[PDB]
Amino acid sequence: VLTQVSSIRLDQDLQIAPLADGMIAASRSGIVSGYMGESIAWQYNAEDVITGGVGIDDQGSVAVIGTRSGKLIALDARTGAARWVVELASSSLAPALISGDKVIVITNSGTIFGLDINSGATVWQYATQVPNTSVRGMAKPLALDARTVLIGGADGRIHALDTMTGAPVWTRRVGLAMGSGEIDQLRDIDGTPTVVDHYLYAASYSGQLAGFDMTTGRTMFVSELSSTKKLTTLADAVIGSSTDGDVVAFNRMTGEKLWENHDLKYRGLTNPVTIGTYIAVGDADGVVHILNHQGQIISRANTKGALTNLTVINNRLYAQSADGVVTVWQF
């Protein structure tokens, strides 16, 4: 199903930012490399541990990284030159979203920051509530349309914000606390919600996967799936990876269970991704498993290093390991 196309060691949960003729990848040690094909076009040293990235506009022209110390840096995607460097009151563990003239950042404090794309100035802030202990990591903000951004919160809610002002447009509860204790409160939506047409899906650490009809604002279903990873869709199936290492599929209109694969239990799975008519999910041994649409494993590609995130862009599957290895496959 997959043929290896590249295997690159990065100079020393970060995501690759694919470009039309290459890619941008950051090492957690601080080096952001812009690649043209398999050769380095540029490098930028952040002089700090990179905790969030690589964010990229849909036009492939500006890249964003967040550092452990709360710095947020915008880079020209072609040259690697910094456009601006600002310091926020909190660090980010997810890539920044670029929408319109805004860079939108989720942070440890629960604050969502709306930044001016040209200067990095803070235009707006939106505070979400965060339990004293929450699940480590966060969801990348998502542009619903030109005027609405969707935030997955540590409070288990989806927050819909006006892109220009930061004001809340609406919210929905997905993750549910089971009490006041530190374990019982854990309910993060740490996987970026999934939009297909006017339908919205999100899952949560506490075990709820909700499907929403954004046209009516109605809840279509709530099913059982504890997850910290982005969901994927395949025709009428919505599919996710559980915190137990299950891969499970639901009907994305009714919420009924389609299939559930237990072969990868406890392996530490990435988000599952859709590759054509197949599904791919990676694990902590560096193995990417390929599933058919009936949830049966038919193939396995192996890389070096633990995987936590898979990215599909056009025809290629991108994986960045914790060992700093970036692997690309085509399908």
CB atoms within 10 A of CB 92: 28
Q: Which is nearer to Na ion, 127 or 181 (CB)?
A: 127
Residues in 257-296 at the binding interface with Na ion, rule: CB under 5 A: 271
Residues in 209-248 at the binding interface with Na ion, rule: CB under 5 A: 219, 227, 229, 231, 240-241
| CA gap 178, 196 in Å, rounded | 30
Q: Which is nearer to Na ion, 39 or 180 (CB)?
A: 39
The DSSP letter of residue 10 is P
Q: Which is nearer to Na ion, 92 or 163 (CB)?
A: 92
* Minimal distance, residue 331 CB to Na ion, in Å: 20
Tell me the residue number closest to Ca ion, measured at CB: 188
Residue 88: its H or E element = none
Binding of Ca ion by 154 (CB under 5 A): yes
| CA gap 4, 6 in Å, rounded | 6
| CA gap 165, 92 in Å, rounded | 21
Residue 290: its H or E element = strand 287-291
| CA gap 271, 232 in Å, rounded | 8
Binding of Mg ion by 326 (CB under 5 A): no
Nearest 5°: the CA angle 319, 5, 288 is: 40
* Minimal distance, residue 129 CB to Ca ion, in Å: 12
* Minimal distance, residue 180 CB to Na ion, in Å: 25
Q: Which of 190, 202, 269, 311 is the binder for Mg ion (CB under 5 A)?
A: 190
Phi, psi dihedrals of residue 231, rounded to the nearest 5°: -85, 170
What one-letter code names the amino acid at 88?
A: L
* Minimal distance, residue 138 CB to Ca ion, in Å: 5
* Minimal distance, residue 74 CB to Mg ion, in Å: 25
Binding of Mg ion by 99 (CB under 5 A): no
Tell me the residue number closest to Mg ion, measured at CB: 137
Counting every residue written for the chain, the total comes to 331
Residues in 187-216 at the binding interface with Ca ion, rule: CB under 5 A: 188, 190
Q: Which of 105, 135, 150, 279 is the binder for Na ion (CB under 5 A)?
A: 105
Binding of Ca ion by 135 (CB under 5 A): yes
Binding of Mg ion by 135 (CB under 5 A): yes
Concatenate the DSSP letters of all residues of 133-194 into one string: S--S--PPPEEEETTEEEEE-TTSEEEEEETTT--EEEEEE-S---SSSHHHH-----SPPE
Sites of contact with Ca ion (CB under 5 A): 134-135, 138, 154, 188, 190
Sites of contact with Na ion (CB under 5 A): 10-11, 14, 25-27, 31, 33, 54-56, 92, 94-96, 105-106, 219, 227, 229, 231, 240-241, 271
